[PDB]
Amino acid sequence: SQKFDVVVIGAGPGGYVAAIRAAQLGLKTACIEKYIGKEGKVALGGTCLNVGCIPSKALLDSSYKYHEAKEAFKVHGIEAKGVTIDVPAMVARKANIVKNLTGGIATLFKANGVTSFEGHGKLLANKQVEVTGLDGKTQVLEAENVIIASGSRPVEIPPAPLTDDIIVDSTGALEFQAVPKKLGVIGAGVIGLELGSVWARLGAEVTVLEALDKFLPAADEQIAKEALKVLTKQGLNIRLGARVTASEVKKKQVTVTFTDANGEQKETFDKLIVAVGRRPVTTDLLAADSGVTLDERGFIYVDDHCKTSVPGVFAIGDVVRGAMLAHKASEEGVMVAERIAGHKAQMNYDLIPSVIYTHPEIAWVGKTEQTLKAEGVEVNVGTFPFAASGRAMAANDTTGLVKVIADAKTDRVLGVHVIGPSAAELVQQGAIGMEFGTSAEDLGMMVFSHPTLSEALHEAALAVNGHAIHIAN
Amino acid sequence: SQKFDVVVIGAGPGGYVAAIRAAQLGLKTACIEKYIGKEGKVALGGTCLNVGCIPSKALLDSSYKYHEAKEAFKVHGIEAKGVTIDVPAMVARKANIVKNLTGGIATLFKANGVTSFEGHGKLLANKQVEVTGLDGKTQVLEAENVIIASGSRPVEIPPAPLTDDIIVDSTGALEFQAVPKKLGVIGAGVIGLELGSVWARLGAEVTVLEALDKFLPAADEQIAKEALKVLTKQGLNIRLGARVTASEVKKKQVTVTFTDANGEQKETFDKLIVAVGRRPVTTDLLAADSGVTLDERGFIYVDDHCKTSVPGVFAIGDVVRGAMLAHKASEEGVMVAERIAGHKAQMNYDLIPSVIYTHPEIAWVGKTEQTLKAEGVEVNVGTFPFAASGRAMAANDTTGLVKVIADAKTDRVLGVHVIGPSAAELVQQGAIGMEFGTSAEDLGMMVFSHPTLSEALHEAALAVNGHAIHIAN
Numbered sequence: 001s002q003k004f005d006v007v008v009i010g011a012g013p014g015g016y017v018a019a020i021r022a023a024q025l026g027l028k029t030a031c032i033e034k035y036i037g038k039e040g041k042v043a044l045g046g047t048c049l050n051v052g053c054i055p056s057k058a059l060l061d062s063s064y065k066y067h068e069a070k071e072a073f074k075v076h077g078i079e080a081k082g083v084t085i086d087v088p089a090m091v092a093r094k095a096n097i098v099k100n101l102t103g104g105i106a107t108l109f110k111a112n113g114v115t116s117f118e119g120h121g122k123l124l125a126n127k128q129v130e131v132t133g134l135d136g137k138t139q140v141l142e143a144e145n146v147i148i149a150s151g152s153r154p155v156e157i158p159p160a161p162l163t164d165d166i167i168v169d170s171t172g173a174l175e176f177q178a179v180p181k182k183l184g185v186i187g188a189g190v191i192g193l194e195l196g197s198v199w200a201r202l203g204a205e206v207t208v209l210e211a212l213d214k215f216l217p218a219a220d221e222q223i224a225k226e227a228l229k230v231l232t233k234q235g236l237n238i239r240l241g242a243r244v245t246a247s248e249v250k251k252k253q254v255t256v257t258f259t260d261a262n263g264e265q266k267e268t269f270d271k272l273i274v275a276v277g278r279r280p281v282t283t284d285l286l287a288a289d290s291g292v293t294l295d296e297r298g299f300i301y302v303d304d305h306c307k308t309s310v311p312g313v314f315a316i317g318d319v320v321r322g323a324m325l326a327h328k329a330s331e332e333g334v335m336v337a338e339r340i341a342g343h344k345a346q347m348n349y350d351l352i353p354s355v356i357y358t359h360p361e362i363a364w365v366g367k368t369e370q371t372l373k374a375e376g377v378e379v380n381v382g383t384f385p386f387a388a389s390g391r392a393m394a395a396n397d398t399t400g401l402v403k404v405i406a407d408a409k410t411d412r413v414l415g416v417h418v419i420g421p422s423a424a425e426l427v428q429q430g431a432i433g434m435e436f437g438t439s440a441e442d443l444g445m446m447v448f449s450h451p452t453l454s455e456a457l458h459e460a461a462l463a464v465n466g467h468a469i470h471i472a473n
Numbered sequence: 474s475q476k477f478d479v480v481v482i483g484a485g486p487g488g489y490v491a492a493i494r495a496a497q498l499g500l501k502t503a504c505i506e507k508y509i510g511k512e513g514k515v516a517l518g519g520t521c522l523n524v525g526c527i528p529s530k531a532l533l534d535s536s537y538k539y540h541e542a543k544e545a546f547k548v549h550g551i552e553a554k555g556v557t558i559d560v561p562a563m564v565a566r567k568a569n570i571v572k573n574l575t576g577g578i579a580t581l582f583k584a585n586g587v588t589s590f591e592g593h594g595k596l597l598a599n600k601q602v603e604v605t606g607l608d609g610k611t612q613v614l615e616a617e618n619v620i621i622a623s624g625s626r627p628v629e630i631p632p633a634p635l636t637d638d639i640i641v642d643s644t645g646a647l648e649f650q651a652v653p654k655k656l657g658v659i660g661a662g663v664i665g666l667e668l669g670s671v672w673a674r675l676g677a678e679v680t681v682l683e684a685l686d687k688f689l690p691a692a693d694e695q696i697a698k699e700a701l702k703v704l705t706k707q708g709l710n711i712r713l714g715a716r717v718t719a720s721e722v723k724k725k726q727v728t729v730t731f732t733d734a735n736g737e738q739k740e741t742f743d744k745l746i747v748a749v750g751r752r753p754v755t756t757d758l759l760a761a762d763s764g765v766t767l768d769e770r771g772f773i774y775v776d777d778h779c780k781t782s783v784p785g786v787f788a789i790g791d792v793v794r795g796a797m798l799a800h801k802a803s804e805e806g807v808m809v810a811e812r813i814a815g816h817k818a819q820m821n822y823d824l825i826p827s828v829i830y831t832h833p834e835i836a837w838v839g840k841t842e843q844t845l846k847a848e849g850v851e852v853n854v855g856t857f858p859f860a861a862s863g864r865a866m867a868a869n870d871t872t873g874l875v876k877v878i879a880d881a882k883t884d885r886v887l888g889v890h891v892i893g894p895s896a897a898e899l900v901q902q903g904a905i906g907m908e909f910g911t912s913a914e915d916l917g918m919m920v921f922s923h924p925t926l927s928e929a930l931h932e933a934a935l936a937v938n939g940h941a942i943h944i945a946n
């Protein structure tokens with residue numbers, strides 16, 4: 001009876017980080033994973049490494065370099081005679097990076113002493129974990145603690161079931177072997193905007209159909225308004241308030257029927273991406289007498305420390321409440337492992353940053369202006385546009401702004417929101433300050449290197465209290 | 474004859490920021506500047522905006538985009554048939570950026586009520602400032618406070634005097650209208666490396682002659698070693714321990730004689746850049762009875778508040794001690810203006826970041842490993858290479874590392890050093906943490922967005938105490 005201090009089900013950002021940290025803390029750790037990768041063998045890394053964060057960013061980076069060479073080289077004096085993109089080669093570089101990184105997780109497991117099991121894990125009664133191998137044979141592990149990290153999968157919609165290579169979800173959208181001439185996207189969330197951007201940059205004519213009237217409702221309204229304008233200018237035909245009701249595939253095209261403010265509409269595409277959210281994965285995960293309970297939406301019910309209804313059983317990442325993000329999952333894995341080891345590790349769910357990897361990049365941490373207004377919190381706001389940044393001018397990349405929101409009474413920074421170059425790095429600067437309880441004046445008093453994009457955060461913080469140097473307060 | 478609360482001599486990063494801040498604080502402020510820019514009008518912004526920070530970064534950004542297109546596009550599937558660079562067009566883009574930014578300072582002066590004088594300012598006795606206009610008219614301003622911000626100029630050396638357009642300093646090197654076939658550079662400091670990189674990327678064969686045996690002695694030794702390796706890969710023939718002894722111009726070429734470990738050498742170039750430091754400018758600045766004194770090296774003598782030997786007379790920026798950097802000058806300008814207004818403002822000279830705008834970028838804040846060893850401070854060091862960064866792999870830019878140095882007894886972060894993508898933004902994250910007295914464990918406990926280059930700083934901080942997740946410890 002193989003006994004472990006910790007058995008982790010799933011090897012995505014939540015599970016594989018939890019497993020490594022547990023091993024670092026001296027806990028005898030096992031990690032169970034079932035996903036078969038491109039080589040026909042089990043591949044670690046979950047959604048983020050295999051069909052998620054890293055593959056998307058690889059294609060975003062390649063497609064942006066092509067786009068800049070095609071549309072933004074002449075101002076530098078650079079003449080490029082006939083620039084082209086080989087989509088199979090672009091996708092192959094992405095696939096090679098995925099291969100390398102997933103293999104790297106297995107190397108980390110070996111270096112840290114994590115025992116890997118290949119197959120489907122199911123929690124039985126009494127913290128026993130049944131592993132069904134690829135050959136259908138089972139093995140039962142005895143666990144002192146179980147960490148459930150089974151992740152999520154794309155939401156499906158009746159009008160647009162996945163079909164051949166014509167209707168795809170995010171996984172298929174990362175595998176096109178040619179630029180789709182006309183590309184439809186259902187959902188103007190982060191996946192729809194990122195993957196729509198990839199293919200628009202390479203020449204696709206993209207329409208994004210979004211059910212809600214409000215664009216990027218979790219973002220600060222000023223940021224979202226600028227994002228909608230800029231992304232529309234880049235060729236993302238974002239249609240808000242569009243209710244998709246049907247589709248039809250014929251002649252290797254897909255016609256989508258939807259209702260908007262002006263009635264019933266139809267639009268035809270060569271490919272259709274369905275990007276309407278993700279849902280937690282619990283299929284065959286829990287024995288009927290396991291004791292673990294689910295909430296109304298199918299997530300595993302946990303407390304603020306990711307502990308389930310069963311002592312010694314925890315659940316982390318996309319399968320539990322909170323932002324469905326990779327750094328959220330990994331930090332929960334660290335917390336759970338450290339608490340199993342006896343440390344009072346806690347998580348601040350208030351300072352988890354968000355990033356949308358469009359270009360311009362969008363990122364934020366903390367609260368939006370509209371949220372604080374709804375809460376009745378009086379605030380001071382400071383903004384600085386990249387159009388006034390010398391570094392951004394040198395970069396030929398002046399779209400966007402930095403926004404800092406501070407409490408009007410205490411001057412404590414309550415949110416930092418950026419659309420523009422290096423948005424994620426500037427928001428991380430703001431997040432570090434907020435971890436220490438920074439005021440806007442604190443940020444203003446620091447020495448920021450010149451010329452850097454970081455100066456825009458410095459100026460925005462000074463603008464909170466009306467004495468930015470480089471804008472007319 | 475005309476009375477002001479504050480008279481500022483010079484409109485570079487020190488002076489123009491001091492003037493704006495003084496005006497914001499309600500002080501009747503004048504700013505004197507003599508520099509005529511490219512449009513034939515007085516141009517504010519000093520060295521940094523006109524012939525320094527901003528023009529260099531514009532040419533660095535343009536030349537990098539050309540270089541990437543030539544050498545690093547095919548892996549993405551991008552084929553560029555015959556990429557070329559029009560040097561006049563590249564320089565014209567830079568000139569236009571300079572025009573727009575310098576005009577922007579004048580707009581800020583007008584919006585804040587700063588009175589501009591065109592001409593040369595000279596401090597007389599009793600805080601009177603004589604202004605000799607470019608039109609030869611003289612007038613005396615009666616100042617309650619004077620801020621001297623006269624800046625610096627390139628060091629000159631007898632073996633390599635500036636000559637026509639063949640032997641130039643940094644100003645001339647930003648104005649080449651064609652790529653020199655063979656380019657010589659005296660000095661492997663930040664200017665030599667940055668401007669050498671520009672022209673190497675566009676096809677010049679670049680040789681850098683450095684008198685010292687040690688490369689980038691102010692940088693962390695590990696960072697400097699990596700920098701030398703990558704710059705060698707990029708085509709910079711950096712010759713250490715090379716003492717230039719003579720030069721000769723003939724037939725539109727220059728032959729340089731120098732001594733190295735193997736004796737006397739000669740090398741011929743089409744152009745020669747002399748980049749061997751900068752010296753403070755005090756020419757005709759101080760009347761003999763002004764009361765302001767100079768130190769042995771020609772800098773104006775000031776205390777830690779930038780106050781001279783004369784009450785109410787201050788000196789800031791490159792003309793006084795400390796790092797000759799634009800953000801140092803501007804922060805001193807803010808301090809001095811706030812102190813004139815009655816605030817007990819102070820300057821923190823310990824957390825001024827340094828950036829070298831090569832690609833990969835080099836940046837650091839705080840102390841190097843070798844400095845701390847010389848001081849007898851026991852430290853723990855953590856490093857993380859960008860070769861292990863998923864974000865950097867997606868970007869096709871995996872050279873370099875992040876290094877965090879912490880006190881072994883308190884775990885307080887004492888230095889952060891980066892060579893690689895977004896080095897300056899990552900160092901600014903470290904600097905913000907250090908302003909708040911962060912430990913390495915503090916940084917390790919924060920949530921960093923994934924996938925971002927910032928994660929390399931998070932992992933390096935975790936590595937300090939031996940529990941980075943994504944590299945062996």
Ligand SMILES: Cc1cc2nc3c(=O)[nH]c(=O)nc-3n(C[C@H](O)[C@H](O)[C@H](O)COP(=O)(O)OP(=O)(O)OC[C@H]3O[C@@H](n4cnc5c(N)ncnc54)[C@H](O)[C@@H]3O)c2cc1C
Pocket residue numbers: 009010011012013014015032033034035045046047048049051052053054056119120121122149150151152170191281284285316317318319324325326327328329357922923924
């Ligand atoms: C295109 C796309 C792009 C994204 N980009 C980003 C981004 O840029 N930044 C960000 O923060 N987030 C991003 N995300 C979200 C991110 O991928 C998820 O938040 C993250 O992967 C969640 O980690 P997890 O460990 O909870 O789940 P997962 O990554 O899904 O891993 C769950 C693992 O558990 C396995 N598994 C499930 N059930 C079992 C079982 N019974 N037995 C054995 N194994 C099982 C699965 O095979 C899987 O490997 C993106 C997602 C998508 C789809």
Ligand SMILES: Cc1cc2nc3c(=O)[nH]c(=O)nc-3n(C[C@H](O)[C@H](O)[C@H](O)COP(=O)(O)OP(=O)(O)OC[C@H]3O[C@@H](n4cnc5c(N)ncnc54)[C@H](O)[C@@H]3O)c2cc1C
Pocket residue numbers: 450451482483484485486487488505506507508518519520521522524525526527529592593594595622623624625643644664754757758789790791792797798799800801802830
């Ligand atoms: C090629 C080059 C690249 C550089 N890149 C960077 C970088 O990337 N980052 C960074 O931080 N630093 C950089 N620097 C250094 C930076 O330019 C200086 O540190 C900064 O300009 C100093 O500001 P200052 O106000 O003290 O002096 P200055 O910028 O030199 O301004 C002094 C002003 O005073 C005027 N003046 C002088 N005497 C008088 C007088 N009697 N009366 C009226 N006017 C007078 C001058 O015309 C001048 O405009 C670079 C420098 C060079 C040469």
Ligand SMILES: NC(=O)C1=CN([C@@H]2O[C@H](COP(=O)(O)OP(=O)(O)OC[C@H]3O[C@@H](n4cnc5c(N)ncnc54)[C@H](O)[C@@H]3O)[C@@H](O)[C@H]2O)C=CC1
Pocket residue numbers: 157186187188189190191192194209210211212242243244275276277278323324325354355356357
């Ligand atoms: N940069 C990052 O952090 C990334 C993280 N993710 C995360 O993965 C998860 C899934 O991403 P998304 O699919 O984009 O979910 P999402 O919630 O971000 O966006 C889904 C959008 O589709 C809309 N929607 C739902 N049903 C619809 C319907 N019939 N018709 C039209 N629109 C409909 C929704 O209003 C929403 O705007 C999210 O939690 C996301 O945060 C995914 C990609 C990148």
Ligand SMILES: NC(=O)C1=CN([C@@H]2O[C@H](COP(=O)(O)OP(=O)(O)OC[C@H]3O[C@@H](n4cnc5c(N)ncnc54)[C@H](O)[C@@H]3O)[C@@H](O)[C@H]2O)C=CC1
Pocket residue numbers: 630659660661662663664665667682683684685715716717748749750751796797798827828829830
């Ligand atoms: N990214 C940034 O912050 C930049 C700031 N600057 C600042 O401008 C000032 C001057 O820049 P640099 O000219 O590069 O000075 P520097 O001090 O950075 O380097 C000058 C180098 O030339 C060497 N030297 C001196 N005499 C020599 C001789 N005969 N022969 C060969 N080498 C000799 C020195 O050892 C030194 O390495 C510096 O203070 C610099 O920080 C300038 C450019 C960019």
